[PDB]
Structure formats: C-alpha cells, structure tokens
C-alpha cells in the first residue's frame, strides 16, 4: 500500500507515460530482486516454512493475557486470566507496534511468552451506537423550511463535499451546532435526513440513557463513546433530548443531581478537550434549551444555534402535498380547509392525521380516503 499520489496529468502525455514506465520498471527490479532472494538463497524455501517454524514455536492454545505495562527489550509483565501476572518474554515476531495496555495477547501455554497480539473480536456497544443504513428520503422530504437546510449543509455537508473553499478562505468550519425550538418541528428527522445524506460514520444516542446506576459510570461512558467516535473515521455524532438529563430526575441513579453535574463537567471537557480532537463533528437537538447550562452553548464548544419555528400555512400545504403524495385520495377532500383546522398544529400532527385516515379507510376495506375520514381523524388524533 501507499505507492505514490499523482492524478495531476490524467491525459495522453509523457507526464503519465513516463511515470507509468518508471514505476513499472521499479516494480520490475523489485520482482527481479525478490526472485533473486528465493532462487540462489532459498534456504529451504524461506517464505512460509519460516512461518511454519514460527507457528510451531507458537503454542497451540491461547493463554490470553492482559497487558498492563511495557518494557522495551523483548519482555514485559502481563496479567493472566486467573489474575496471577507473569513477567514473560516476548517474541521476535510479536510485531511490537500495535501493543497497547489492556489488550489481549497470545502467549505460550508452557513458558507463556508473548507470542503475538490479538485482534479484538469487535465490541458490543459499537454495534449499538452505530447506525447501519440510510434511514429514509433525503432533503427533498422536509419541505417548508429551506433555510436551516442550507445552513446545516454549509456547516456539515459542505466541509466534506467541498474541502477546497475553506483552504482559499484559510478558515476553520464551525464545530458545534444546536438545533432547538418547539417540539415536533422536525429536529430528530432533520437528523434523519442528514444521516441519509452523509457518507461519514454516524453515531446516535439520546441523552435520556446517559443516567446510570453508579458513580462515575456516566463520565466514563461519555469517555469511551468519544473514543469510539475518534477511532473509526471522520464522524458525526448526534445527541437528542439533552434537556432530559437536567429536567427528569430519577431514583435508579446512586447519586442525585450531583453525579449529573459531574457528567456535565466531563462532557464540557469532552467538547473542548485540549487534547487533539480532529475531524469529529457534533450535532445536537433539544426542545427545552433554556434549562441547559449555558456554558455548554459557548463558541468554541457550540458555534451555531438554529431555531425551528412552528410551520407556516404555505409550508403546511407543502407538508400536505409531501406526505399525501403516495396515497390514493378522492376528489372530495381538501387540504386547504385542513390547513387552519388547528391553530397550533405540528408536522407530526399532519402525519398522524393522514395515517389515521388511512387506517380508518382500512376499517371499511376502502382504498381511497374521503372527507369524513379526515373529519373523524382530527378529533381522534389531536383532541383528547
């Protein structure tokens, strides 16, 4: 791997022909010398029989140890599974580069010497925290807003798709972004839309499960959450309903709001860690933003704040056209009457109305909706 980066000419030219001929001749002498090394110096065969001798020197089982300290000169102390640690030697082929404390190592069964390092067999919570596939429709699905969409593309999507503009700007793209507003306006979905659009690794967990039953486990949890976030890729991390951590109290926690405060100070450290952060981007969403500690919201930790207003009626009819598109509607229905049917209605409300109208039509095995279906839908959905 890592041969040479060159995509400059990309044409019928000696600036490509020369490069290709020189590199293929370099591969030619590489091939000729490696042919030299197993022809007049085969030893036995020197490619896999050496591997065979190592594998023979490798013990059949794995006395798996846990690493706790390092000594440079081909030995160290390792702790056994039963807990009786040993100061065993290492192998010459123990590939002394990916050794880290707390890691699984293949040891011998007799002398227990460090034979090799063990690849981790995945991790439980990396599977839980990582969203696998794209959820749903892209930015054509929202409708109505058309302003915060451009902003969040500028702050998140634009650094990835156009990593050139900031270079002639000589400037850094914004880091921390709050989404806020009345609930049901489309924050955690706008989250779904941007999750669909992006190609980077995506992380999602809600603040509600940041409470935990002991002391310090919350801050520790945030620690390896961000560790997983850093160790994979350029990543976008999404936390939803952060205000719950400050609003809803519980009894399952060992400590009260004190341990909550400790978790808060840890995450305030984590957003502005003086250690090298890198290309990890942060997206938040919270309806009750006023209850949060304002020092979390600061520039350097949070750069953008985006309000989500209640939808306008011209946006309401856009939502009507969007959501009722794939369903069969009769001519007797009218969206315009249903626009102002409620003074204070949300984007969840219209979807709930149309789904209830769909199931009400399914009650009588009917394919098309009628006006009375919405007329009976409105009080079922909203009015209780």
């Amino acid at each position: 791997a890592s041969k040479l980066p060159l995509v400059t000419p990309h044409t019928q030219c000696r600036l490509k022909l020369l490069k290709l001929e020189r590199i293929k001749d370099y591969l030619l002498m590489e091939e000729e010398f490696i042919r030299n090394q197993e022809q007049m110096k085969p030893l036995e065969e020197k490619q896999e029989e050496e591997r065979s001798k190592v594998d023979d020197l490798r013990g059949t089982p794995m006395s798996v140890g846990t690493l706790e300290e390092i000594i440079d000169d081909n030995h160290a102390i390792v702790s056994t599974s039963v807990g009786s640690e040993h100061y065993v030697s290492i192998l010459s082929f123990v590939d002394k580069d990916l050794l880290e404390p707390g890691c699984s190592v293949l040891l011998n069964h007799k002398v227990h010497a460090v034979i090799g390092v063990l690849m981790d067999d995945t991790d439980p919570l990396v599977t839980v925290m990582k969203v696998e596939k794209a959820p749903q429709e892209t930015y054509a699905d929202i409708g109505g807003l058309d302003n915060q969409i451009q902003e969040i593309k500028e702050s998140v999507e634009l650094p990835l798709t156009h990593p050139e503009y900031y270079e002639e700007m000589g400037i850094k793209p914004p880091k921390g972004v709050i989404l806020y507003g009345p609930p049901g306006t489309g924050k955690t979905l706008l989250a779904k839309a941007v999750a669909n659009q992006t190609s980077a690794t995506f992380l999602r967990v809600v603040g509600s499960e940041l409470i935990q039953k002991y002391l310090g486990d919350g801050p520790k949890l945030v620690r390896e959450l961000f560790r997983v976030a850093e160790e994979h890729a350029p990543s976008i991390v999404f936390i939803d309903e952060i205000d719950a951590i400050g609003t809803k109290r519980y009894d399952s926690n060992s400590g009260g709001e004190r341990e909550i405060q400790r978790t808060m100070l840890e995450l305030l450290n984590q957003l502005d860690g003086f250690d090298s952060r890198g290309d990890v981007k942060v997206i938040m969403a919270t309806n009750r933003i006023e209850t949060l500690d304002p020092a979390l919201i600061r520039p350097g930790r949070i750069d953008r704040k985006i309000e989500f207003p209640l939808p306008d009626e011209k946006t309401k009819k856009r939502i009507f056209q969007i959501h009722t598109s794939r369903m069969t509607l009769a001519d007797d229905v009218t969206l315009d009457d249903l626009i102002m049917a409620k003074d204070d209605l949300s984007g969840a409300d219209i979807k709930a109305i149309c789904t209830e109208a769909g199931l009400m039509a399914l009650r009588e095995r009917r394919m098309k909706v009628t006006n009375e279906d919405f007329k009976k839908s409105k009080e079922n959905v909203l009015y209780k």
């Binding site: 959820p135 779904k192 809803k248």
Partner: protein, 90 residues
C-alpha cells in the same frame, strides 16, 4: 417512571434509524394523564386503547371461561352470581 424513559429511547430508536422491520412495542399501564408530554406528541404513539371495567355480559362470559375447569353441578344460574358482584374487575 423509568418505564416511560425506556419508551423514550426505544421509540426514538424505532423511527427510521433501525433497519430490521417486524418489531413493535406494546405498553400496558393505567391513568394516562400522569405520563409525560414526551409520549404525548401524536406522532409518538400510533394507537391508545382503553379497557373498561366488565359489565354483566362480560362478567358472565369471564365466569364461564373460568368455570369451565371445575367439577360443577347441573343448574347454576351464573347470571345471578355475576349480577351479585357489581363489576370489581376481570
């Protein structure tokens, strides 16, 4: 109230973010006025269903399906027994 918070993380997990279909959630409780406003957005919950206390026909039917499995006697008139109890519960 931890039942409600579990419904928070579960229901926001099953909203498009998941990929494995045929998974749904059922909640049984009482006194719906006490639960938080978070589950009260109409998009959160698809259906809410009330169970009334049993009336005379329901009491008689439940009495039948429980009296199926004892050594009864010919001639009972379980209607009188059902109307004797003023519908405690099932």
């Amino acid at each position: 109230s931890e039942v409600q918070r579990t419904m928070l993380e579960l229901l926001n997990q099953l909203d498009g973010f998941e990929a494995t279909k045929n998974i749904k959630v059922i909640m049984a409780t009482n006194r719906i006025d006490i639960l938080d406003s978070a589950l009260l957005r109409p998009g959160r919950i698809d259906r809410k269903i009330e169970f009334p206390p049993p009336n005379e026909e329901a009491r008689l039917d439940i009495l039948k399906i429980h009296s199926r499995k004892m050594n009864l006697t010919r001639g009972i008139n379980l209607r009188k027994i059902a109307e004797l109890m003023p519908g405690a519960s099932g």
